[PDB]
Nucleic acid binder design. Structure first.
Lengths: 207, 157, 218
RNA sequence: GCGGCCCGCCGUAA
RNA sequence: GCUGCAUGGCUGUCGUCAGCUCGUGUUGUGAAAUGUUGGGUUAAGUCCCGCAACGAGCGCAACCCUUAUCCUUUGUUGCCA
RNA sequence: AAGGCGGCCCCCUGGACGAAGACUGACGCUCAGGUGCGAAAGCGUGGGGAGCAAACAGGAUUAGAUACCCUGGUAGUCCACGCCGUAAACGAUGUCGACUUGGAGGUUGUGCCCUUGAGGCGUGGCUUCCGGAGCUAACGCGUUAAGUCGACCGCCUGGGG
RNA sequence: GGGCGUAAAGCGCACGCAGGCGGUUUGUUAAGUCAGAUGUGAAAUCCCCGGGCUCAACCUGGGAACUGCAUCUGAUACUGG
């Protein structure tokens, strides 16, 4: 255990929060619990789509939720019926009335969460891990990025000690605070336990 | 158009302060099936990288030999560090009867009938030199006639 | 020819035995170069260089020795040709692919240079950029505006520049070196015996080559 | 220029 | 409930020590080497010069927080020449 | 020839080398079995005995110390005459003959040129150190080969036992 | 169709009998060597060209092979006298 969490260390410099609201000591825990419940429900329900990031903001007597995704048509449906079912359930979870929004992901090969869970999904169908890693890295480099690093850990088929591999090219400086690094993880349950996946993407240094 | 062959792959180690780090090597041969052949040798941390790295090195390194209807008229022998090789022409109908890497070299080169044999040590890397061992030190009758200042017909008789 | 403006070998104890065919009798403790068999070889080399220049072959000049530096830099840049003046980098030819990046960096730096301090007044960065450009220019000043892989090389000292000759032999490019008594003909060369440290001698060598090349274009 | 200071059970990463 | 010697995740330690590698090119039959070695410096593979090497990457340094000096803005529940 | 040989003087005695000239006319090379010479230690008989010193005796050091260190000390080391026949007796490289690019020395002869001077040209023998082609598994050897060849002899055949 | 500097392997060094090996011409001999011819080298077996059992194992016709030995004639470059 040696590396500081890349996202957390930059929360006040070049990175925003995901939940933004003000409260006092009385309702802090309740607000946190409600946000946890709604995020968990949304993640469970919208697994089939490509969900990347949930941002929760509390207006005065209200809750506002925005979802970032790469295939918005599936989430929003033929008409607004499915978003309305989601809004009903969310407003049930948290007492205040709720409103929903949809964001658009332009380049799904960035936004490390999508790359990570894509690799996990591939691993779930018994495909060689090395091909998946090389494919993802080549795609990300082709689409334009100054660097990328991926790694996988766990029982990769062999009963011997769980192994670890990683590839990297470009530039991924982790000790400079100005750098804009996107980082996320995932894990896949197989017949031989779980496998961990981590992704670093260096979009570009920010002045 | 070129034919490529893979001969041998093996794992190779090296010791440092923290433990051991491994690597792989590949040995490949490339020929045109007509009298031009070359080989290459590459190293990398992964098998595919070494495989692909040997190929273009072989491509840049080629020589030409002078055969005749699928062989030439020399019982020839060549040597390297610890290997001896013997090759002689075969009449017809026969194949490329030969033990190891000589098989691949003679197959890609363009020979169809030969009676090779290997002595001494037999590790693939030094016996592959069978190219330089004797294949390019072979004399056609016309070049012999040119050297001796005579004509081919009465050189043969 | 007749002026005998070229001196001869170093000493009888620093000599390559392979130079026996070109050697003359030695009298004052030093070897004497036979001039009777240097004129025809020189003329043949001149004719070949003329026919190559008529083919716009992008001839190359080398010879960093602190004495022929300005001489080769003036003989070059005269007609159309390029030169190497300092510190032949090992692998300019076999590893030209990597040297192209250094050339490109030099080009970008010189384009920025004409308005350099205007971009930013942080004098540390401007000064270090100027120093970097100065360091970079001398090693590739003569070769910056070249397509790559010339078709001929002219070498003043043979043994002193063996790396360039090895690279040329590996690539397969004819060479036109000048061989003294303490060197040896190894590469595919148009061997030209003669002294290689006398200023008059080297000037005489380069003048004929420059005239021949400048005529060859027309 | 010179004072002394011994040992480490059996097998065992791919 | 058993197996941290089937695992993910999360920590300790050498150690805030200055090191650890790659692409292309050369040398060797090969394991490998070169670069990273040499002179002078620095807290530092920090920098100049030299040199079959020429360039990159993770490290070092800088970008972050606080403390020490001044200047504008605002002046309560804080201050009084 | 190898083992080996160092103060100075005399007597007996072996080999090598150089210059010039004469003479004999293949009279040569290698060599199983055979014969001779072989450091140091050791053995026999008779002498000699300063220094050093196995064995041995004390004093220390040490967990112990039949050792390294200190004080003594016999055989032996020396001479004459006989035995022994082994050494990392090593260049770890059998003896003869021929051929193949170069540098820097040492030692001992001799010819010529002004022999002026510690001069310049050569031509023999024996020896050290680098290094080219070539050879070698590599280290390395390299005209005094471990290079290219010829004649004869001696040895080797997995490790222990 | 292998080796002996360091992997196993040059006697500690010499002299030397028996053996093995001989610089250059000329002249004779025909022992070695070479070329012919004849006589021998059983049959069966192997091989080649054939034939017959419905084909094949099997049987059979003819030819090459039997690398040798002896004798006679001839050649004279090389080795021997």
């Amino acid at each position: 255990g040696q590396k500081v969490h890349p996202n957390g260390i930059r929360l006040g410099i070049v990175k925003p929060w995901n939940s933004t609201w003000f409260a006092n000591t009385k309702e802090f825990a309740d607000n946190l619990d409600s946000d946890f419940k709604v995020r968990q429900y949304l993640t469970k329900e919208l697994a089939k789509a490509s969900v990347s990031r949930i941002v929760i903001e509390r207006p005065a007597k209200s809750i506002r939720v925005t979802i970032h995704t790469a295939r918005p048509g599936i989430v929003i449906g033929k008409k607004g019926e499915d978003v309305e079912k989601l809004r009903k359930v969310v407003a049930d979870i948290a007492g205040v009335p709720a409103q929903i929004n949809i964001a658009e992901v332009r380049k799904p090969e960035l936004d490390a969460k999508l790359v990570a869970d894509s690799i996990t999904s591939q691993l779930e169908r018994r495909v060689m891990f090395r091909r998946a890693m090389k494919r993802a890295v080549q795609n990300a480099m082709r689409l334009g990025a100054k660097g990328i690093k991926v790694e996988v850990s766990g029982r990769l088929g062999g009963a011997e000690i769980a192994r670890t591999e990683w590839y990297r090219e470009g530039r991924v400086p982790l000790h400079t605070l100005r750098a804009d690094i996107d980082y996320n993880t995932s894990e896949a349950h197989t017949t031989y336990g779980v496998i961990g996946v981590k992704v670093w993407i260096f979009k570009g240094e920010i002045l | 158009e070129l034919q490529e062959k893979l001969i041998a792959v093996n794992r190779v180690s090296k010791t440092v302060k923290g433990g051991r780090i491994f690597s792989f090597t590949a040995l490949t041969v490339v020929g045109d099936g007509n009298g031009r052949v070359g080989f290459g040798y590459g190293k990398a941390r992964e098998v595919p990288a070494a495989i692909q790295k040997a190929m273009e090195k072989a491509r840049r390194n080629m020589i030409n030999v002078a055969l005749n209807n699928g062989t030439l008229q020399h019982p020839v022998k060549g040597v390297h560090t610890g290997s001896r090789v013997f090759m002689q022409p075969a009449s017809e109908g026969t194949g490329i009867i030969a033990g190891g890497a000589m098989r691949a070299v003679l197959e890609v080169a363009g020979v169809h009938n030969v009676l090779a044999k290997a002595y001494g040590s037999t590790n693939p890397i030094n016996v592959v030199r069978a190219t330089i061992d004797g294949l390019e030190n072979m004399n056609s009758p016309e070049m012999v006639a040119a050297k001796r200042g005579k004509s081919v017909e009465e050189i043969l008789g | 020819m007749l002026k005998a403006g070229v001196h001869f070998g170093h000493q009888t104890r620093y000599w390559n035995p392979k130079m026996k065919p070109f050697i003359f009798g030695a009298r004052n403790k030093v070897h004497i170069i036979n001039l009777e068999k240097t004129v025809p070889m020189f003329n043949e080399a001149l004719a070949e260089l003329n026919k190559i220049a008529s083919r716009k072959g992008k001839i190359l000049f080398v010879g960093t020795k602190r004495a022929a530096s300005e001489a080769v830099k003036d003989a070059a840049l005269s007609c159309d040709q390029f030169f190497v003046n300092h510190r032949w980098l090992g692998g300019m030819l076999t590893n030209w692919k990597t040297v192209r990046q250094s050339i490109k960096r030099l080009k970008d730096l010189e384009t920025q240079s004409q308005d350099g301090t205007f971009d930013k007044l942080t004098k540390k960065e401007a000064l270090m950029r100027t120093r970097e450009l100065e360091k970079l220019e001398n090693s590739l000043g003569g070769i910056k505006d070249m397509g790559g892989l010339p078709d001929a090389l002219f070498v003043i000292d043979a043994d002193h520049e063996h790396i360039a000759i090895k690279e040329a032999n590996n690539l397969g490019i004819p060479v036109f070196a000048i061989v003294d008594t303490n060197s040896d003909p190894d590469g595919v060369d148009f061997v030209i015996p003669g002294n290689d440290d006398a200023i008059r001698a080297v000037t005489l060598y380069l003048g004929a080559v420059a005239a021949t090349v400048r005529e060859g274009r027309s």
